[PDB]
């Protein structure tokens, strides 16, 4: 009953980040607060537009905005990145608790090299207001027209005409 419209593979050939999981996790805190604006725009689209195909343009933007976050640290102290994500990779659960010294060394550069700051606890979990230009969807669920409710009761109650009206009972 229609077409499941799918985007062509052309727009899907977007640059994808090629890094192991521990690389993301090691720099996750220093990535979330510093690339929030496109991230919030994309994920606002995901929950508002409610359709995957609508947020394709933003989908490549966050991936792109990940790459220019993953490039200056190469033109800066990529060496403290190496052992830090290596040590995190050694952990089975990628626990930060064991590898804190390399975290400090990693944090020391970005405080001065790019001048970033480590986000505090709860800061990343804060709900943030994202400023966008796209209009809000009208019917994200594509709802149809709604059946009209049956008319309500109205008018004052009057005594039953001629009583119960059940066989010979007068009242």
Partner 1 sequence: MNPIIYTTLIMTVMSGTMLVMISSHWLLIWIGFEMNLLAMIPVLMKNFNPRATEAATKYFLTQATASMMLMMAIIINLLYSGQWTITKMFNPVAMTMMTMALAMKLGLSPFHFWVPEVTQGISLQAGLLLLTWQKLAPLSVLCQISQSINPNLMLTMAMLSILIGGWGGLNQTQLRKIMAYSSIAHMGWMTAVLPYNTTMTILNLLIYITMTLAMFMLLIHSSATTTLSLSHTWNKMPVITSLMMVTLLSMGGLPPLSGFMPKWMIIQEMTKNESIIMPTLMAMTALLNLYFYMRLAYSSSLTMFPSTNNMKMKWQFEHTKQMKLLPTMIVLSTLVLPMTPALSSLN
Partner 2 sequence: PFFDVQKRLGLDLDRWMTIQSAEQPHKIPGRCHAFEKEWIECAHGIGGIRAEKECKIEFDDFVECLLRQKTMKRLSAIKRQRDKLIKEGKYTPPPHHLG
Partner 3 sequence: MMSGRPGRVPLQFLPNEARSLPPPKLTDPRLVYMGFLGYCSGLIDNAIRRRPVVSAGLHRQLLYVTSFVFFGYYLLKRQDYMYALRDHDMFAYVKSHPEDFPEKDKKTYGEILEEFHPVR
Report d(CA 113, CA 75) in Å as an integer: 10
Site for partner 3, residues 124 to 163, rule: CB under 8 A? 151-161, 163
Terminal-to-terminal C-alpha distance of the chain: 60
Residue 144 binding: pick among partner 1, partner 2, partner 3, none (C-beta 5-8 Å cut-off by kind): partner 2
Q: Does 141 bind partner 2 (CB under 8 A)?
A: yes
Q: Does 139 bind partner 1 (CB under 8 A)?
A: no
Closer CB to partner 3, 10 or 156, in the complex: 156
Q: Residue 129's closest CA among 41, 9, 10?
A: 41
Q: Does 143 bind partner 2 (CB under 8 A)?
A: yes
Q: Does 146 bind partner 2 (CB under 8 A)?
A: yes
Per-residue b or e along 60-70, where b marks 16 or more CB atoms closer than 10 Å to that residue's CB: bbbeebbeebb
Residue 161 binding: pick among partner 3, partner 2, partner 1, none (C-beta 5-8 Å cut-off by kind): partner 3
Report d(CA 147, CA 126) in Å as an integer: 40
Give residues in contact with partner 3 (CB under 8 A). Answer: 151-161, 163-165, 171
Give residues in contact with partner 1 (CB under 8 A). Answer: 163-164, 166-167, 169, 171
């Amino acid at each position: 009953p229609g077409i499941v419209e799918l985007p062509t593979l052309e727009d899907l050939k977007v640059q994808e980040v090629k890094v192991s999981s521990s690389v993301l996790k090691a720099a996750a805190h220093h990535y979330g607060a510093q690339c929030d604006k496109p991230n919030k725009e994309f994920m606002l689209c995901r929950w508002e537009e409610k359709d995957p195909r609508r947020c394709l343009e933003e989908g490549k933007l966050v991936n792109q905005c990940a790459l220019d976050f993953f490039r200056q640290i190469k033109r800066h102290c990529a060496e403290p990145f190496t052992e830090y994500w290596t040590c995190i990779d050694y952990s089975g659960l990628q626990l930060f608790r064991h590898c804190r010294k390399q975290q400090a060394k990693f944090d020391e550069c970005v405080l001065d090299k790019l001048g970033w700051v480590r986000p505090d606890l709860g800061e990343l979990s804060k709900v943030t207001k994202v400023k966008t230009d796209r209009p809000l969807p009208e019917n994200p669920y594509h709802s149809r027209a709604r059946p009209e409710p049956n008319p309500e009761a109205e008018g004052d109650l009057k005594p039953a005409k001629h009583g119960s009206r059940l066989f010979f009972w007068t009242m």
